[PDB]
Amino acid sequence: DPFFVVRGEVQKAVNTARGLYQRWCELEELDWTTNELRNGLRSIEWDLEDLEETIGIVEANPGKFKLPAGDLQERKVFVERMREAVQEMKDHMVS
């Protein structure tokens, strides 16, 4: 399943979580939103872990994958951006 396909799915999930987060900040509805967001963030993180593992595999075996170096770097930046986006929301859910 190509990285670019997964990338689009992860971005959509982060955008959806941000929508929930904006609702949560505005605000039983609060309890439901808290749960939905916590679950949603955990789900995104599982997906990010998988992307990170694939980056590691591809970098370690360039003969097999032949992924251009620029493209590999853009994957790492994408994962870092998404991790940061998730962490911003997670910070506010603590406790």
Domain residue limits, the chain: 1-95
Helices (H), 27-68: 29-60, 62-65
Dihedral pair phi/psi, residue 66, rounded to 5°: 55, 35
Method used to determine the 3D structure: X-ray
One-letter amino acid at 30 equals L
* Residues ≥6 apart with Cβ < 8 Å to 12: none
Query: Within a 13 Å sphere around the CA of 3, how many CA atoms are in the beta-carbon half?
Result: 19
The correct CATH number of 1-95 out of 3.40.190.10, 1.20.58.90, 1.10.10.60, 3.40.50.1010 is: 1.20.58.90
Q: Rounded to whole angstroms, how far apart are CA atoms 92 and 70? A: 34
Q: Rounded to whole angstroms, how far apart are CA atoms 42 and 33? A: 14
Query: Within a 13 Å sphere around the CA of 65, how many CA atoms are in the beta-carbon half?
Result: 16
